[PDB]
Structure 1
């Protein structure tokens, strides 16, 4: 298991524009296009991201290219962030994947707001961090996925995903 397979499991793969759990226009492997309610705005974003006139449908190769870029961006967002970098640096390789998963889903700003959870992770208080992590809009809106990411933080294994 690795971060790409992990996020592939959580985000799925759709080759046509769809609405994510929040109702936002999205495509491929959880690639957010826009928060605007306009399908045309979304198609325009898609054409721009892919570099061709798509009409809302992309290929698997294109979905995967967007995915590669998004994972790379998430990782680099963490490394450039002053609240996130220290936590990442302190974690083992499995739990690092968990952090990348959160950032991928809710953004660098969003994760950096889990101030208390981040401090417990740095101290390696896994059970305590798990409980604090569950007290969140994130957990209540997407329980199954949050559970998987939280269990990963708690155990340091890939068991939530096998």
Structure 2
């Protein structure tokens, strides 16, 4: 168990563009592309949407991907996607210190959240981060459970939350 496995589990893997849970054009190990649109307003908006997706895709890939990729390709983006997140965290004056305060397993937990909801969003968990940084695991856990993140993605959140609290990988084990 490491951050990779952890998000590989949490994010899934598909080698053909699919409409995710959040309505985004997505591919690989949760590498979003485009934001899928509304209730029947296309074509042409549909077409434009997917194409943009493809384009975004071909961009990241370096080739004419017809919205279909390979494990190797997905996996390449995933690692990138991970890096970017670690980086957000360490540049972010809110996250940075929490991260610095954390341990290996707990770090993966923070990374996960960022990977999933981005630097800014994660950076807003003012109180939870506080607790985190103070090593108030249970308090933190409880608080994190009152979140929108949690309400919207309970299973996953639950998983992420148990890691912070126990400091183990039990919820992935």
What's the TM-score, normalizing by structure 1? 0.97
Deviation at 1:34, TM superposition (A): 2.2
- Distance in 1 (CA, whole Å) between partners of 2:148 and 2:54 is 29
Question: Matched residue pairs, number?
Answer: 162
**Cα pair 1:12 1:30 within 8 Å, conserved:** yes
**Cα pair 1:36 1:42 within 8 Å, conserved:** no
The structure whose Rg is larger is 2
Change (3 A) 1:152 1:60: same
Q: Secondary structure at the match of 1:32?
A: strand
- In structure 1, the partner of 2:145 is 134
Q: Which runs of 5+ in 1 are unaligned?
A: none
- In structure 1, the partner of 2:22 is 22
Deviation at 1:143, TM superposition (A): 0.6
Selected match of 1:85 from 75, 96, 104: 96
- In structure 1, the partner of 2:119 is 108
Alignment partner of 1:41 is 2:52: yes
**Cα pair 2:23 2:36 within 8 Å, conserved:** no
Would you identify which runs of 4 or more consecutive aligned residues in structure 1 move more than 2 Å?
A: 34-39
**Cα pair 2:159 2:171 within 8 Å, conserved:** yes
Change (3 A) 1:38 1:62: farther
- Distance in 2 (CA, whole Å) between partners of 1:135 and 1:20 is 24
**Cα pair 1:12 1:29 within 8 Å, conserved:** yes
Deviations 1:111-155 (A, max 9, x none): 001111000100110111111111111101111000000000000
Q: Which runs of 5+ in 2 are unaligned?
A: 40-50
- Distance in 1 (CA, whole Å) between partners of 2:139 and 2:35 is 34
**Cα pair 1:130 1:151 within 8 Å, conserved:** yes
Deviation at 1:36, TM superposition (A): 5.0
Deviation at 1:37, TM superposition (A): 2.9
